[PDB]
Amino acid sequence: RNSLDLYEEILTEEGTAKEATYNDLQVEYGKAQLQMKELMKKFKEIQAQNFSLINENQSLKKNISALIKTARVEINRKDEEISNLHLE
Amino acid sequence: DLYEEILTTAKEATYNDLQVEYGKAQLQMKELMKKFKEIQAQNFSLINENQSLKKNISALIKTARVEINRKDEEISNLHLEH
């Protein structure tokens, strides 16, 4: 019966192994999901950061364009009056 | 009949199922890291650019204020010698 005795010991030895490989997979899966959750929370942060950065960036581009134009016009009104005084 | 039980099975199919799930999770994670580093890079670019614009605006106001006042002095002096 030692061929059957070995057969039964074999079935359980392979069963113990496959269940422990499965167990390992279940654990590594959950670990990975924890990892994901953390990175997702970090990602949402820099994305919101990214959102306000672009907003600030657009407004600054607006402002520095507007201030240039209002300045160049304000200096032209000067140069025009100077010419008129040079013309009187 | 020996090994027919262990060969024939849902124990190993559900292992495969989860193994596929675990693989997908990893790839989803690798894709997320990619997007993260991409968005992060933009922020470093935006932070850099924004701070230099604020400085540029400041420098702009200063030289504008100076040149305008200078023209204004020219105008005063013109009336005076007139």
Author numbering:
A (entry chain B): 52 to 139
B (entry chain A): 56 to 63, 67 to 140
What does the study report here?
FLASH, Flice-associated huge protein, was originally discovered as a protein involved in Fas-mediated apoptosis and later in regulation of expression of several genes, including oncogenes. Subsequent studies showed that FLASH localizes to Histone Locus Bodies in the nucleus, suggesting a role in expression of histone genes, and that it is essential for histone pre-mRNA processing. Biochemical studies revealed that the interacting N-terminal regions of Lsm11 and FLASH form a docking platform that recruits the HCC to the U7 snRNP. Our crystallographic studies of FLASH NTD demonstrate that residues 71–137 adopt a continuous and stable α-helical fold and mediate the formation of a coiled-coil dimer between two FLASH molecules.
